[PDB]
From Swiss-Prot, chain A:
It comes from Homo sapiens. Its main location: cytoplasm. PANTHER family: PROTEIN ARGININE N-METHYLTRANSFERASE 5. Residues 282-572 form the SAM-dependent MTase PRMT-type domain. Residues 422-594 are annotated as: Beta barrel. This is Protein arginine N-methyltransferase 5. It is found in: Cytoplasm; Nucleus; Chromosome; Golgi apparatus. One of its GO terms (biological process) is negative regulation of gene expression via chromosomal CpG island methylation. CDD domains: AdoMet_MTases.
From Swiss-Prot, chain B:
SUPFAM superfamilies: WD40 repeat-like. WD repeats lie at residues 1-53, 56-94, 101-140, 143-183, 186-222, 225-265, 267-301. The gene is WDR77. This is Methylosome protein WDR77. InterPro entries: Methylosome_Comp_WDR77, WD40/YVTN_repeat-like_dom_sf, WD40_repeat_CS, WD40_repeat_dom_sf, WD40_rpt. It holds the Pfam family WD40. Component of the methylosome complex composed of PRMT5, WDR77 and CLNS1A. Found in a complex composed of PRMT5, WDR77 and RIOK1. RIOK1 and CLNS1A bound directly to PRMT5 at the same binding site, in a mutually exclusive manner, which allows the recruitment of distinct methylation substrates, such as nucleolin/NCL and Sm proteins, respectively. Found in a complex with the component of the methylosome, PRMT5, CLNS1A, WDR77, PRMT1 and ERH. Directly interacts with PRMT5, as well as with several Sm proteins, including SNRPB and SNRPD2 and, more weakly, SNRPD3 and SNRPE. PANTHER family: METHYLOSOME PROTEIN 50, METHYLOSOME PROTEIN WDR77. GO terms for molecular function: methyl-CpG binding; transcription coactivator activity; ubiquitin-like ligase-substrate adaptor activity.
Amino acid sequence: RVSSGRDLNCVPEIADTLGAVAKQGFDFLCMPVFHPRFKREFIQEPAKNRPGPQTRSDLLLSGRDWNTLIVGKLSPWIRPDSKVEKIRRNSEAAMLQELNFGAYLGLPAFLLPLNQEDNTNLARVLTNHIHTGHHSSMFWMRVPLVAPEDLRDDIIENAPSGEEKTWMWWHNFRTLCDYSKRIAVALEIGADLPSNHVIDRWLGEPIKAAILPTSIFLTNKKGFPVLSKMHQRLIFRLLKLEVQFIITGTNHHSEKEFCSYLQYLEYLSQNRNAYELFAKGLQSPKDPIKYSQYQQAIYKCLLDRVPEEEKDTNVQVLMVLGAGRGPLVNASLRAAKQADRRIKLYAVEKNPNAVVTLENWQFEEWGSQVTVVSSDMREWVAPEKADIIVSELLGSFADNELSPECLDGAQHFLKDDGVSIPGEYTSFLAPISSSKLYNEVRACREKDRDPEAQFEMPYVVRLHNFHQLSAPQPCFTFSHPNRDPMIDNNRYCTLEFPVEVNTVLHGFAGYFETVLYQDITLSIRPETHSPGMFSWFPILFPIKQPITVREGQTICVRFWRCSNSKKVWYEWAVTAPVCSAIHNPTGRSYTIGL
Amino acid sequence: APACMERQLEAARYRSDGALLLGASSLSGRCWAGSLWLFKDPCAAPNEGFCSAGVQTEAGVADLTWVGERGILVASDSGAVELWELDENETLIVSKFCKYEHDDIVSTVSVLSSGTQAVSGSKDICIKVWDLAQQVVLSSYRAHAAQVTCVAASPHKDSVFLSCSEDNRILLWDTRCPKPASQIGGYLPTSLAWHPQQSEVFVFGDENGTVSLVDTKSCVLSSAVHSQCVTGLVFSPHSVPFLASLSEDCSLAVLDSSLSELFRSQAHRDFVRDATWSPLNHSLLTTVGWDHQVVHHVVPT
């Protein structure tokens, strides 16, 4: 359900306001910690000796009300990036005072206006307050989708980049605040919206609140406020990002008792999938749709391997490499029933903790049809030659987790007429901008290792708070069985991705596509996502220092898959528009061990 | 009547019979509500018991002005413009209306020269124009890019008012035209005053304390009067008027057409908020501040 709040700059008494506010159903109140007209002097005599209390005392509300029901506001008279020395230094001190009272109160969050082009000083005052032991607070920088210098009316006797610079205000803020997790954006909407190509970027930010003026709401024929469709789409995306919606302004629909504006959010939040339902909650490396497509593939093979009159006499030899707990063996068996064909099966797992489970299956359900091998597929001196080798040694990135080195190792007991399942798989890459995934990468900073090695290692993730810059391109192709002698899985690849708009690059996202057998495909590529398959999430490859890109350029990225008899690893580097150090050289941060 | 008043006095406005009007607000404390106080005697102020009439508001008071004689117009903290009538004997104050037509604080309010219409500048960037007799807004011009700090209705032409904002713009407005606003010529503008006789020429004050005289047809004759933000520029009722200037420097400087300083009062302990020359003694200037003092300065002329 939607969460929402009220932006009141006038608060005569807090229990009166919070009393009537909560009755209208708002979850929280954004209010200022000091009166916004009450200018204060600190450097200048004689005003700095002002008697009396500087604000309403914190005793008026219980500590639970402050920490949950309230959000702060920075006073509008504060221009810490003003050019005038005396207006600046008084404004640095007031901000510390209104923020430290934000700490002393225990407020969950604080609103800070970003509307100027230069906000270098404002960040310093906020960089000095984070490093004070005040972690119970958040900063919601108030930045609009469209600047005030563009939303205005052109009714002046002079003529009235220019659409994206609302973001560059922000990226130059967090970059000055070292991409702190304690800084978020409250995105101020207005009646004029940018193109969707920008919105798709803004949702890559940590949008944590959305400020909705009442002046965008139209009036329907029933007299109730509504949003035109170009807004309702954007709000449907914001709801998916779980932001909190703030109703700024006042009742223009003066008859309707201001709570009507909130009622429509509680309408849109209802009237708008299983991958998002199953997914919830970065990690360093019960899906029957994924196993059925293995089953249908085996069915489509056995009919193709076995003529109809050899059904009773053709002993089809399957080797289920990486059987694990044996779901692929139930499938390999169910296909035979579905195909009505004789199969003999060697289920191979090394892990004794699972051989215990397969061996129990053999005695309870499968019978003598299923052989189990306890030695590993690279050691086992097998007695007979497989007609098929079936497997999921795959990973989120297909050539990860040693599916090739194991299958091409288990190829010396495959018939020359034989096939392999998955027979082909090809991994896919695209650049992504994600300021939230990048901070969740830095959050992995771990003691007793090189503090930048967390960027030289991938992370599995349900990509949710991310923007994608280009259609994914195939990086690495593998087809099994290898029809050739020596030639090696050590591979080199280069990819060039076009770019449309100014945006940071924080990594490249891994997907994959696999041909189990002809016209049967598991896939998590977005443009060809398999239905209802969610076992394999994408992966994230971070980079040491983010890359800020200009439109019209190309992102040229080089990946290597390199290996020896001991280790297997990846290396990756961005070289256009700018050179990024070759990541994970010699497996110093990441390996998938043979 | 209200038993108490607030410390931080924000506005002072005489009328023709010399009666003094104060707007007072709580810029601190538990309740940021505010109050209007009418004094037949400017010297009886600020004591509550010596007033003639006054009333509490359900929200702050940022600015006020006189609509005719039996009425007051009020800029509220609540994003609303309130018109308050006086009683028959002017011992009581009554709401002509209260209307919430701003998404943020009503920073300043001025009345157009005919007295029927009013202009309410604001921090919610849109300036608006009010019809006081119909009690409804006719126009809403969102021309600026920031907080409209101050405005000034023309003293001769009803359709004309000024506006300035933190975007450094200084705009002349004419609500008869199809694109009403036009720009007048680095420090930001804080307050404006039309010259009551040279209706086409005005003065402005900026945050750096410089004071200027600039014509509509044009240029910056100016002087560095104050050290800090010039909150208000006010013109005396003389034939040859004297330009009062009051600042956040807690000082009051009074000027003439040459912009040279004739008088300086550092008697205020805090920000001087407003100044209004008395009609019964043109040498007498009354001020108010957040230090709660009500001061009457007599100026050598």
